[PDB]
Amino acid sequence: PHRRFEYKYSFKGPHLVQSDGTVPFWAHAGNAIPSSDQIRVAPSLKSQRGSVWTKTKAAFENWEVEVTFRVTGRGRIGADGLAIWYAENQGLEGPVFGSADLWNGVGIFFDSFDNDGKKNNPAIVIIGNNGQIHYDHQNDGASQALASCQRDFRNKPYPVRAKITYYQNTLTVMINNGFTPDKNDYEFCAKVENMIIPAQGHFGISAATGGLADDHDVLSFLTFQLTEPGKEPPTPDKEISEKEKEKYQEEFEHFQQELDKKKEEFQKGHPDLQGQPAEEIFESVGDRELRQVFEGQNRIHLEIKQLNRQLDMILDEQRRYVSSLT
Amino acid sequence: PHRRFEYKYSFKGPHLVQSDGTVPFWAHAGNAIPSSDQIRVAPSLKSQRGSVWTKTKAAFENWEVEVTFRVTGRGRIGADGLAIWYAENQGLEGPVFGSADLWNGVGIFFDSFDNDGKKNNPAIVIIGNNGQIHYDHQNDGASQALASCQRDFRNKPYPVRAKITYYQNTLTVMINNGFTPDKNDYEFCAKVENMIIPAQGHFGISAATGGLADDHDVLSFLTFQLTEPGKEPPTPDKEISEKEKEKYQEEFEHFQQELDKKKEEFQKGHPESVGDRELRQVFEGQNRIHLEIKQLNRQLDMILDEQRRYVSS
Amino acid sequence: PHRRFEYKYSFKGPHLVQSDGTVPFWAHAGNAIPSSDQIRVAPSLKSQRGSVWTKTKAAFENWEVEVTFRVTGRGRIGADGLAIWYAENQGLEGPVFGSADLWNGVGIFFDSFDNDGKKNNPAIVIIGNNGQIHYDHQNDGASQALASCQRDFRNKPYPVRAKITYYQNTLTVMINNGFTPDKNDYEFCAKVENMIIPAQGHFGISAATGGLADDHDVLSFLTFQLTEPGKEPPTPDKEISEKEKEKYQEEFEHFQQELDKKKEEFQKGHPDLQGQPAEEIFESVGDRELRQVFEGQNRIHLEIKQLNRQLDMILDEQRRYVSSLT
Amino acid sequence: PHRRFEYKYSFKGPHLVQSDGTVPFWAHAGNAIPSSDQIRVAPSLKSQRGSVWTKTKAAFENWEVEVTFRVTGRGRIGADGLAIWYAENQGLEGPVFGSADLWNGVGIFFDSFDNDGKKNNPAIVIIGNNGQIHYDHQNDGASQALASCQRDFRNKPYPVRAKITYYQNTLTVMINNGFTPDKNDYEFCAKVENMIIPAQGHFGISAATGGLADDHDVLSFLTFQLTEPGKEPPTPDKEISEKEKEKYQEEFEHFQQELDKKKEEFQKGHPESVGDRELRQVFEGQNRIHLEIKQLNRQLDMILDEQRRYVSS
Amino acid sequence: GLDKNTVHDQEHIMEHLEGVINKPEAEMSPQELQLHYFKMHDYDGNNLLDGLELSTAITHVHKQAPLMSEDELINIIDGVLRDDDKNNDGYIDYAEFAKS
Amino acid sequence: GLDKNTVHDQEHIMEHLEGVINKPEAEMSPQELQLHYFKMHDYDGNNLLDGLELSTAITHVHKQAPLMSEDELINIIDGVLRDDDKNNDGYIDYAEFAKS
Amino acid sequence: GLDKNTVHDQEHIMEHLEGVINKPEAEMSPQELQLHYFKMHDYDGNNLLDGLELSTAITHVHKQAPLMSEDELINIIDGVLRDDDKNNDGYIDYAEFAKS
């Protein structure tokens, strides 16, 4: 298909916010803490709710959404999770993932807590609703689950990238598992066929936190309008010629390759600039616990060292006490 | 020494924040996010600064503060760290651990990033200041460090407890390493003798975040006024007789036992996990080994001083 | 649909073998070790290959297969995994999960080792083949994967039950995750639409082990022929009447309820019979490691106790030595 | 003593089995499944029995066997356990740990299931039968136990090493608990003094599995003939001079160093994990603590015997 | 091949009930012992008989005898399923079993 | 402000005990409900009351109403500490609490 | 609103290149500085400009000034995309950017 990047329904780093402190073309509410790098929709405190929705409604028949996010928890269990909504009204505050219930649209829930007790979480659940069906909060929407693939998105070394595409009344969710820094490494998760959604509606994201607590960051949100090749108006008159393209792109490439060498000798010329790897950032929960045990053993080692040294001291004190008498 | 819990300069859970959304008797500024059970002074976002100070100034000559906190980072490197201030004016926003520079008072910095590059971090640094010398941010206050320490307080399984005591112009910082859930398990960290501080000032805490990012949560902050046994004047005949206390406490304990039995049949009448319990057992076993070795050290010291007096004879 | 249980293509306990030592109507080869309760297709030794196939070919157009199996590993990484085949030629030995390559049929692979390094394992991969395509062993059949759902089947507290249904050229794989003792608790895994398979062929199972090792047990294998309600001739004239059914089933129920009470007083009458729970059988890898560390601390505890006893002994020895002089 | 390794009564990896499929100089029977690196005497299926015995009989008066094995179970309860026999006839199949009853020799049983119900299992039991004692299977040989022990050898992170030594009519069993990868880290388990055994007999091992299931792998089995320094006759002038040894060993070490450097550039020229390394570090720290406490015990014993001689004066 | 006299055997039923239930009875009705047969041979617990359970029932090991060939076993069980099982489910119920 | 009638309130104690205690009692002695008040409002579990716990006890939402000013709460808690607490420890004990 | 003189500003480009590259030049060609502008404002690294990068390019913070309203920002960016972007991809390439 043909994709057009729509800026009015998108936000990306590293200038996500403005001097005012709000996201352009987006309204945030709840415990959302928008920053230049990312938006923390729900922080790691108890009973947090946050949501970021679009201001103007999006009128698309075929669209594609690329959501980059992180869910980092200290424990091995998350609380509620992320939710990506294409609805008719701005949900804002509510009891479903920090968003209002009884929505008229589609929602992809990244559930990370097993309310039902079926040991099938974390999982991705696509739920459509017409606005009069209550969401089953206590059962993770098992009855309403149109398609439910199972994947782990918590505590991953790289941001999890998901792609939700509505095309010919078919919703395809393809989820990068966040194990590799490569962008275009998407893996299929789920699809729903013949689903009716409102023609125009708001794009939103939301998150919530229950007893346990996770950090629910969203790094970027991208929206692409999709059109069929046959239904795409050609209008090739605007394109002038290929001669100007050939006259321009090679000087662009030459400028890039010259600027690389221009930066090369001053990257190392000034030693103030320093790098930093992204490997020590990631550490598993079990690895952290084992490192904690190993760190705790050092007190025992040092105390035993002190005991041994004191015993050596009393031994030498008895050593010097023998020859004094005779 | 005698200790009196001053409530006006303290906060604790689980009702830390009110319905209004502010900490009682405490003014917060910056990126501090007070919650029901803890105050996140600085979250794990980039370039965050937060501080919580007292409203009224505290006039004490001998005081003690017990701060329970957590510094949790995804990586192995901390961002900036915590800071506990006893100052003359409310710093609020600023460039020194999320608080203003040129402060008139004492500050205990829990530095978690090695700006100096000496591989001596994370560390606890006590700095006194009269308000005329700038803090050395790029060298972790090496020149201004009246007394230093070397403890790791990041990613600990249990909240790290610190106790800071100003007594007879001596400031003693004793820090629990956060390996045991016991409260009164403090280990000596640092001390400063003959330090002059303002007689009255504000108690505050603050945190900041640099390139890397940590979460600096503060669970409790308890302030006790300290007085000497001889200096405190007694008040005879004001207290009640011990007979009434003996009459009362027996019925109190009987009622609490009866309430336990009343709760027993409704806990199960109306309806931790594996793995976490094993790790808790591992940590308890390590603590038991540590206590047993400490007892062995005490016994060896006892036999050493027993033999000490046997030499001069 | 209508299901008919076909015994010639099935094996169950607790009499899975005979006095001869072979599975009836099934031929096993490789390192398979058939027992009276399960078949260990590949044991926990290095470089094991095993396969169990049917003797006669099965001529079905719509069928259902229920496979109950266990994959138990000491470590956290599997060896190769199981493979369930519906191929027209028996492969007794080979390099693909202990079975021959270039098969003419369908194969459901329970891959438990990530050859590709994509960190997407263990996963269930459905692969069809027409006998001229080799298996991408080094990439877990990523290119040939018709449908690949992700589930964990290793070290589960209960046997993993899987159900593969071929019906109207649609292959549906529904996998019980092995977390609950309930039998009918199947959860959907994958489906493949419009796949052509040979009309008649052999049902088989196989397993293999690499440098790392797992135990690959198979507890049961059930085959059901599936027929459409309209295609199956009812022929109700062969049945006698419902009167005999009403005359028989109540005496069957009465005999059952009488035999229960008959066994009740002699279950406790003879105290030689003893029970055993199935909870201590299951233990996670991290839980086992933490238990191993806790067990290791007991040596240090005992040694410190011995040290304290010796120090008390020398203290008392110095205690009695003082008053002797004076 | 002087220990001569006897290859005819031994097996080890990583080439334990041959192309034929049988253990060299050893006959296996039952459900034993020899492999390239280990021999699974009994797998974790229901009612398994296996044994591996020697073909030829060994005629030694003082001997030593070093057995490395693993007993791994999914559950917390063992099936039957291992058994190491020095008998007169090959037991092969039987009802006693997968070996025949009424044996004329000694048998060391690593019982892992408490048939007696005394909660004293898993335990090591040395039994010397002389041909008319039926092993008390329902009581774990409590009456026949010449000497017992109490060790856990199941689900250990490392292989369990045992050393059984017959020397001067005394049988000493020293068992590594399997917490450290070090080979020579044996701890005393049991001993029997003045026990009569046949002069020549077969060395064997066997295992059995009940309703509960365990895997009984055997990684190695090494037999050493023992002789006294005074009893062994020397052979003067047969050995070569030390000058040739000094000439040879220097070039051997130089060549192995050069081979290390040769392997260095092709290890990375032509192309453990996290978490497991942390667990290994934890176990190494535990072993270091154990060794330091043992050194402390040695030093305390030294000062105790120093004060022992100071009393009589 | 599952004859009328084969199921009507008191000794085989008494041997099977030995150990599991300690109630040795003298004489029982033919329907009672056939109920015992049907309940005892249903190893799975579904109150149903099938080819795999009938294979255990026919090729049986008591306490020598040569093992039956696979072809004879297949023919016997196929004949039994074709004769008794009328609902074409593959399983044999007690209502279907009581006919013979 | 911690009055005699405020502590002796059956409906307030019943509301606080709702959920945790599934035993609705009819009538209780004044010391009984005052013991329930003291036990419920001690969150830290040290059998002691302090300024923060008293502030939580007085200024809590229940089930709209405007919040009390901080100066009034400071005055009330200071008066309570000056009146009841005689040991000058900062904490309020049931021995000191039984006076009022 | 992305005028010819707006991109043709040596001081803004010199301020942006400060720090990242320590090469302060005296005078550069208009095409050279517009190449610097296009390369610098491409925050992501795709060698493309879009609405989100042009928003940060227009609403800019140097070292006071009032912030531009959202409607004016939307109108300016929509006009720029309608004028320059001819392939209807949503992104703006250097070939499309060199027209104005």
Add this chain to the structure above:
Amino acid sequence: GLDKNTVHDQEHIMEHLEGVINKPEAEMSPQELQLHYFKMHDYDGNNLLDGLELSTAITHVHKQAPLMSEDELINIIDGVLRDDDKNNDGYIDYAEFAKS
């Protein structure tokens, strides 16, 4: 049976070093290959050879041929131990191995 020509075999050493060592050499001194043989066939890494390691060295498949009888292997290993090993330790050292 551990002959002088069997140890001094360049092709056998090259085959054993294939894969592990990516350095095909042309010609080597007899002591050099014999050192490579001794180092390669010591699997335990104790710088010692024994009857088991010698049996693996002699009877290995390579790339059909019938396996040697066990009695011949026993005789060969016994002869080697009686000839070379003088310390009666059971192990074969390079000091003892250098004789042949």
